């Protein structure tokens, strides 16, 4: 199922007003979903590459944070 519509426009509205926006256009949501799809098409692909390299098929959180720090987004949290 196509779950890109699962990111509803009230959720994108709450996320945008979290960042400090008071007026959000209606066309913001489509490009926001596209950028989220690009980010989850890169990072999860890198995690799939790590999990395939590890002779596994369960995606761990350490592969996720490895993909995040590979692209320059260092994350402190799950995995260690």
């Amino acid at each position: 199922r196509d779950n890109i519509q699962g990111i509803t426009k009230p959720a994108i509205r709450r996320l945008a007003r979290r960042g400090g926006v008071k007026r959000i256009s209606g066309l913001i949501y489509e490009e926001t979903r596209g950028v989220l799809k690009v980010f989850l098409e890169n990072v999860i692909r890198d995690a799939v590459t790590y999990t395939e390299h590890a002779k596994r098929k369960t995606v761990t959180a350490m592969d996720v944070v490895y993909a995040l720090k590979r692209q320059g987004r260092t994350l402190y949290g799950f995995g260690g």
Partner: protein, 97 residues
């Protein structure tokens, strides 16, 4: 039947918290985030020291290499104060032998 022994610094994190804040507690995910920060800073300084040792064609890392790595990686006075106290952290390391 334990699985494996962990490799973290949570007891040392709690001890450092006890020297700084004797009355303030810590949570588990805060210690996980702090341990991730410790590991990232350790990897950054170790990689910078390894690169700087490879630049001068030296296979041995001394205290001067990691002093220069701390100077390069850390801006502001946070390196420079670490220039001083870490040096005397060397000195009473050498005075205790």
């Amino acid at each position: 039947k334990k699985r494996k022994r962990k490799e973290s610094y949570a007891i040392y994190i709690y001890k450092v918290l006890k020297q700084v804040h004797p009355d303030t507690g810590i949570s588990s995910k805060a210690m996980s985030i702090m341990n991730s920060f410790v590991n990232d800073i350790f990897e950054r300084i170790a990689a910078e020291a390894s690169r700087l040792a490879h630049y001068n064609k030296r296979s041995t890392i001394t205290s001067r290499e990691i002093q220069t790595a701390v100077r390069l990686l850390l801006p502001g006075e946070l390196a420079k104060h670490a220039v001083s106290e870490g040096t005397k952290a060397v000195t009473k390391y050498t005075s205790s032998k």
